[PDB]
Amino acid sequence: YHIDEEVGFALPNPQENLPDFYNDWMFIAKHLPDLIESGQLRERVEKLNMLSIDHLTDHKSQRLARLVLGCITMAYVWGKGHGDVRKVLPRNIAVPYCQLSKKLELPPILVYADCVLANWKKKDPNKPLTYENMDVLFSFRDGDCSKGFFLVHLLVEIAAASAIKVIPTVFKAMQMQERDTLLKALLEIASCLEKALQVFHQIHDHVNPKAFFSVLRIYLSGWKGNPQLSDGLVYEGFWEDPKEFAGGSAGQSSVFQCFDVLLGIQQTAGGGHAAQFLQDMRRYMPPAHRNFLCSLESNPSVREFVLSKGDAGLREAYDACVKALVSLRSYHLQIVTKYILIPASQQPLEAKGTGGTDLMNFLKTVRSTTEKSLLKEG
Numbered sequence: 001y002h003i004d005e006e007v008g009f010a011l012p013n014p015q016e017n018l019p020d021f022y023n024d025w026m027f028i029a030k031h032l033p034d035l036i037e038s039g040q041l042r043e044r045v046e047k048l049n050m051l052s053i054d055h056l057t058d059h060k061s062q063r064l065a066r067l068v069l070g071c072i073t074m075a076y077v078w079g080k081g082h083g084d085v086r087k088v089l090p091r092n093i094a095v096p097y098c099q100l101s102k103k104l105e106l107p108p109i110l111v112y113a114d115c116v117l118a119n120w121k122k123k124d125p126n127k128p129l130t131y132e133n134m135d136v137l138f139s140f141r142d143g144d145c146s147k148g149f150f151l152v153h154l155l156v157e158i159a160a161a162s163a164i165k166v167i168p169t170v171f172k173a174m175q176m177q178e179r180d181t182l183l184k185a186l187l188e189i190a191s192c193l194e195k196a197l198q199v200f201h202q203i204h205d206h207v208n209p210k211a212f213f214s215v216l217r218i219y220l221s222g223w224k225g226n227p228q229l230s231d232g233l234v235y236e237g238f239w240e241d242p243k244e245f246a247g248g249s250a251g252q253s254s255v256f257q258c259f260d261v262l263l264g265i266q267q268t269a270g271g272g273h274a275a276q277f278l279q280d281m282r283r284y285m286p287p288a289h290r291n292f293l294c295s296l297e298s299n300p301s302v303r304e305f306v307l308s309k310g311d312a313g314l315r316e317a318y319d320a321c322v323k324a325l326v327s328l329r330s331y332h333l334q335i336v337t338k339y340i341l342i343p344a345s346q347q348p349l350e351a352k353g354t355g356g357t358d359l360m361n362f363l364k365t366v367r368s369t370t371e372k373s374l375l376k377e378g
C-alpha cells in the first residue's frame, strides 16, 4: 500500500527536481515568495505554453509535478492574499494539472499528500530524520513558517507510522487466538501514538500564530463552500463549468484516519456532517492510501475481539490506544485555539476550516466519538 517502516506514508526521499522539459514550471514554483510580492506572478503564469505531461517518467516525478502545479495554482488563485482573487485558471497550466490529477486519481488542487508527504528533502543523507537535517522543497511567502508547519506534520506521520508496522501482528494475533501477543502489540501502538503527541509539541517553536493565520492559511484554502469562489474554480479548456474542490487539511492524511478504523472508532458512520467530511477526504488521498484504509476496514473488529474476552489487561491495552487518540485531539484543539481562534479575534456565524468543516463542532464531535469508544471494564 506504499508504506515504509522508516517514514510511513511519505515518499522515502521524494523527487526534488523534474525533467528539463518542465523548466517553465519549476522556475515559478521555486521562486513563489518573490513573484507574489512583486505582483507579477499572474502575468508569468498567464504568459505560458501548454506543456504536455507525457515526459514525466514515474510516480515520484508525477508527485513532484502535482506539488509544483498545485502550489502554482494556489499562488495564482489567491495572489498576494488580500482579496484580489482569480475565478478562472489559464488553459496552459490547468489542462496538464487536470490530466496529471486524473492519472494519479486525485483532485486538481493542493492536498496533504502534495504539500507535506511530497514536499521535503534530507540535507545531509547520512544523519537521522529531524528538523535540523530536513527542509521543505517549497514555501509560499517569506515568513510564512511553511518549513515548520509542513515538517511538523511529516514528523508526526513518521512517529505514528512506527505503529503501522505493528498492525499485521494485531490481526494475526486475533486470528491465531494469541492473547499475549495482541496485548503487547496494542501497547506498542499506544506507545507510538504517545510519542507522536510529543513530536506535536514543537509546532509552537517552528510556527508563529500570526504568520500562519494571515499569510500561509490563505494559500492552503480551497474553493468548496467558499464565499470568495462560491460557484468554484474554472479549469479552462478541460472543464465546461466551475468545479468545487475542498482545500487542504491534515484530515486528508491516512495515518490520522487509520487508527480510528483499526480500533473500531466509527468516525465515518452515522451520516452526520463530520463523518461525511472524513469519508469525502479519502478521495483527496492517493489511491494506495485509500486502499490501506479499505483493507483495514475489511478486517475483523479489534474492538469486538477485546470486549468478547473478559480480560482487563487486554481492555486496558486497547484503552491506551483510544486515550492516546483523545490526547492528540485534545491537544489539536489547543493548537486550533492558539493558531486560529485567537488570531481571528484580533481581526478588524460559524468559523470555517480550510477543508470546509464547521471546525469547532467538527473537531469536538470527532473527539467526542473517540471518547465514547473507551471500554472501561466491559
Ligand code: HEM
Pocket (backbone or CB within 6 Å): 152, 153, 156, 157, 203, 212, 248, 249, 250, 251, 253, 256, 257, 329, 332, 335, 336, 339, 340, 352, 353, 354, 355, 356, 357, 358, 359, 362, 363, 366, 367
Ligand atoms: C496550525 C496548526 C493547525 C491548525 C490551525 C489545524 C486546524 C484544523 C482544522 C480547522 C481542522 C478541521 C478540518 C478542516 O476544515 O480543515 C483540522 C482537522 C484535522 N487536523 Fe489539524 N490543524 C493544525 C495542525 C495539525 C497537525 C500538526 C496535525 C497532525 C499531525 C493535525 C491533524 C488534523 C486531523 C487528523 C484533522 C481531521 C480531524 C480529526 O481527525 O481530528 N492538524 N485541523
Ligand SMILES: N[C@@H](Cc1c[nH]c2ccccc12)C(=O)O
Pocket (backbone or CB within 6 Å): 111, 112, 115, 116, 153, 217, 220, 248, 249, 250, 340, 352, 353, 354, 355
Ligand atoms: N485546516 C487548517 C489548515 C491546515 C492545518 N494543517 C494542514 C496540513 C495541510 C494542509 C492544510 C492544513 C485550517 O483551517 O487552518
Ligand SMILES: OCCc1c[nH]c2ccccc12
Pocket (backbone or CB within 6 Å): 156, 160, 193, 196, 255, 256, 257, 259, 325, 328, 329, 330, 332
Ligand atoms: O486531531 C488530532 C490529530 C490526529 C488524529 N489522529 C491522529 C493519529 C496520529 C497523529 C495525529 C492524529
Ligand SMILES: [C-]#N
Pocket (backbone or CB within 6 Å): 248, 249, 250, 251
Ligand atoms: C488540520 N487540518
